[PDB]
């Protein structure tokens, strides 16, 4: 499940433009524990920066911070 979402997200990252909606939709389906989702977000951020998509990275890092906080609460 998570590997398929990762494959689709990587396909989206390697496209031109700023259509980030599908990336967010696929991210909202990442299953597993919160640490698994943190690692998933980190890999997505790494690829996005491999393509220098900086504001997409800003948004993904907002996501990462919120997940970190909810994991700290749990």
């Amino acid at each position: 499940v998570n590997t398929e979402l990762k494959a689709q997200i990587m396909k989206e990252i390697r496209k031109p433009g700023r259509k980030y909606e599908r990336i967010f939709t696929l991210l909202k389906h990442v299953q597993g524990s919160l640490q698994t989702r943190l690692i998933f977000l980190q890999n997505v951020i790494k690829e996005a920066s491999r393509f220098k998509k900086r504001m997409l990275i800003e948004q993904l890092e907002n996501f990462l911070d919120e997940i970190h906080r909810r994991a700290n609460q749990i």
């Binding site: 496209k15 031109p16 433009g17 700023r18 393509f51 220098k52 998509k53 900086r54």
Partner: protein
Amino acid sequence: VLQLQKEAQCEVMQEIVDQVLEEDQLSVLASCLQELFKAHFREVLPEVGKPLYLIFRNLCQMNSSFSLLLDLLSELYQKQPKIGYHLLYYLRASKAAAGKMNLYESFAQATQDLHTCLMMDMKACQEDDVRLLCHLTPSIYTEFPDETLRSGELLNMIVAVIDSAQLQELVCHVMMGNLVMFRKDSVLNILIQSLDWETFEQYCAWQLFLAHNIPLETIIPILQHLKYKEHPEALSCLLLQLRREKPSEEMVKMVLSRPCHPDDQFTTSILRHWCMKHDELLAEHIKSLLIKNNLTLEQILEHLDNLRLNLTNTKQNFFSQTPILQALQHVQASCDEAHKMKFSDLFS
């Protein structure tokens, strides 16, 4: 009274009365139509007869009434900025706006200048409707060259949101003579700006530059700005295009002016291609540049030593040429002993 009534036909036939009554404080009317014409600022392009465009219509068909309607549009534009590109679209789609792009300028003059509002409206269109931006770009560049050609911000807007299909459309527009995005006196600064953009943005910028009729010699100073760890997109595109050039002395000088880094294969790549296709001309250029700098001497000699080591995998004669042998012999004496030893195999 004439606004609280505000089917489409009744609405436009009333908006006309609104304008006619205006023709004999408009901020409050602007606020009320700002609220009443929401849900019309939603797509915009189809795959024209709305009540707001009626105002545009009047402005296209109408002296002091002209200024009055321009102030009304100014007030609504202050309340609703999207109006901006909705005007541009109108001036491109309506038959009433045939030969009246000038209106936009006067619109920009009546706002609370042309360059400012054009940049702002193109940015809003990029944020709201990428298809409309793509379809407006040719006419915006053609009608406002003095406000778009020197603008890296507009090109940034465009290359940020386009995909491969829209890039191909823009390329065909350029090659069919319908679109000009660069001019020789400003393209170099724009590409220097470009080196800070995202990956696909730089790829698109270079593909667009290649569609134009601007010689690479115009932008060849950008080589002094390209760092091999930071600008692989531009280095890729520029290398693949430098392949096809008969090299100038300035081009070889700019290539040799890149700092020597063992992990950077750009200089050896292009020098190998040129020496395989234009051995005598490249030897002449290298001899001239070696004698002129006597870009440092040792930089040139290290680049040539890298090329000499590389050329052993293909049969050739480039370093057996009289010009570069003459240059090496002429220039050995200016090195210090450490560099005389560093380049001993080359100086032989």
